[PDB]
Amino acid sequence: VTRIEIRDVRPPAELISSMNAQMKAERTKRAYILEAEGIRQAEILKAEGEK
Amino acid sequence: NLELAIINLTMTNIRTVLGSMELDEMLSQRDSINSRLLRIVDEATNPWGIKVTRIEIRDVRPPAELISSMNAQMKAERTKRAYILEAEGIRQAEILKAEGEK
Amino acid sequence: MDRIGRKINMMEQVLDIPSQEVISKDNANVTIDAVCFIQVIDAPRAAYEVSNLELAIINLTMTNIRTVLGSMELDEMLSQRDSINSRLLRIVDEATNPWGIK
Amino acid sequence: MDRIGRKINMMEQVLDIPSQEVISKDNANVTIDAVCFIQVIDAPRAAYEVSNLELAIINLTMTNIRTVLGSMELDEMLSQRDSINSRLLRIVDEATNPWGIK
Amino acid sequence: RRVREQKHSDSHLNQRGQQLIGRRFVLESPLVNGRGHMRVGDSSWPVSASEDLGAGTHVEVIAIEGITLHIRAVSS
Amino acid sequence: RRVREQKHSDSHLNQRGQQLIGRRFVLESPLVNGRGHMRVGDSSWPVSASEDLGAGTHVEVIAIEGITLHIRAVSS
To answer: What one-character DSSP code corresponds to residue E67?
Structure first.
């Protein structure tokens, strides 16, 4: 009747880094976009000053 | 040994249920986890007694490497405000100096 | 033929909840501590419908705090107080209906 | 057949609130300390509607101070006094209506 | 014999559920399926009614079960 | 002799399955093959009925078997 479970699935140490690099990379995207927005607004303001 | 039965059943279904979800759903959704877990556990424990639990996750720890990547987001969102404020300061300073030169 | 079952307090009580680590919607790792007020409605249920009332309340509240703070921005838990309260009680009240008010 | 229940003071009392760390609306980490005045209206409720009045008042006030200062700029924290008071009492008065005035 | 029909100060002292009986309130969110939540003081209490009642109706408490309050509409 | 037909406070105290008898609820998901789940409180309970019932029907509990609740449609 078991409903056979796998209690735990361990990869070795080498594979874990490769597996969580995905989510680290997905996090860097948000930071990059936010920095881009900051740059955009700063440039607009400086242009007004120069005008 | 009721204790072992319940413990192994719940530790069974938690792994699969959290595996079909992303990390951010693990942060905000509570009703869905509960309903999906009981839809199996209730049929498993029908011969004995109710699993009224409302299964909680008390804590979700990522390792040390992932925490830096996770809070870099909010650090980056903070730098934006400072950058904009500095830009405004520069703008006003330049206008005043231009008046002086005129 | 008659003896005394248990002694039931009927006054509001302050109940600490131990330190806790939560992840915000912005993926921010913060640590919080919380306090609770508990009152027992005159029902005898609080004596016979659960064992160890303290653990039940503590685990229920530490349950819902994590999820509720996880569906909120970090700046929401700095200014909003009514919303946190209402969202928490909308679940805790149904959980503790068999015993006494939260 | 009659004995003395408790002794109720009926004069304004100064009540310290321990040091506290709060985050402003500008995301500024500051530390504050606060004081309280408590008066007991002649009601006997202050003897039988709560245990340990001191803890109740202290935790309630340390509760609302954090949120109230969190919805304010850091400069409002320097000049506005009536607003802080009114916003705090609008909640604390409803919380302590069963006992005595804050 | 002395307690009943003569003394009521302690009877209404330390029982909140009987205190809330007869009070009047208003609703901010409509009841769905005859059940919802209502703001009292600074907290909320669960409420149940016979029929679905919309937002913004005067209601009055009748009885208490567990911690759930029975409410019914009352004219102003 | 005293217990039966006279005292019922403890009889309804510590048995939940008999508490749920007679209560009314509504369904959010249709029953397939005469079996499904229904939300009670903040959790869910397994339910079984004689015929397939669609989403959004008023139902009432009749009997309990194991932890499964027998439900049947009831008019409002």
So the answer is: T
